[PDB]
Design a protein around this nucleic acid. Structure first.
Ligand SMILES: [Mg+2]
Ligand SMILES: [Mg+2]
Ligand SMILES: [Mg+2]
Length: 131
RNA sequence: GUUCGCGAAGUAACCCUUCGUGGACAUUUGGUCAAUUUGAAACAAUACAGAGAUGAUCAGCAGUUCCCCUGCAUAAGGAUGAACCGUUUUACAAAGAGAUUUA
């Protein structure tokens, strides 16, 4: 299969042309955006992955699992701060959904960092969310 | 080059000519751009074939696209214009049962 950089290169170009064709015809079919992001991670190239998600959000922001996976895409590379900024834009974009708040929480508990989860629940309570 | 005027010389008798000088008249074009190979036409020819819905042979309208072509066109054609026909795993839990480890 692959020999050197140049063969990997053509194996990328071919995929990108193909997929972004299939995204070019359907702006929808979110699973396609997901899968294509996943490929983009397996190429160990993040920057493109970040973009590809961002665009995937500008298509639809009300589909959470793309939020989530665009978190875990930042964490599984063991880079946190992006998985923070993403969370500020997330809960601020969707206060009414729970899974964002809970996930940002757990991210701050497995880091043990309390000052956050204090101030955090201070907000997430202060909005009269529910029981 | 014209004209007004002055001075000088000559002709002269207030002029005809020549020289010098003052003044006025007339007053800023064009370039996005160099002259054939190396700052960009597109077809044709060769080879490979040789027309969507079906079991098969055809009429067709659409729909999406960071594809357009012909047409004056908001008409209508261009294979129903072409491309589409593919790759596909996580909001994830609850109850029960066996093996392993530990307070
Ligand atoms: Mg037509
Ligand atoms: Mg036909
Ligand atoms: Mg058509």
């Amino acid at each position: 299969d692959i020999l050197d950089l140049e063969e990997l290169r053509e194996y990328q170009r071919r995929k990108r042309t193909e997929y972004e064709g299939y995204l070019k015809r359907n702006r929808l079919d979110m699973g396609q955006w997901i899968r294509y992001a996943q490929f983009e991670i397996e190429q160990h190239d993040m920057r493109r992955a970040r973009s590809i998600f961002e665009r995937a959000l500008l298509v639809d922001s009300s589909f959470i699992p793309l939020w989530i996976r665009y978190i875990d895409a930042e964490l599984k590379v063991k880079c946190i701060n992006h998985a923070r900024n993403l969370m500020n834009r997330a809960i601020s974009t969707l206060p009414r959904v729970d899974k964002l708040w809970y996930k940002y929480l757990i991210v701050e508990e497995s880091l043990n960092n309390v000052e956050i989860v204090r101030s955090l629940y201070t907000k997430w309570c202060s909005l009269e969310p529910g029981v």
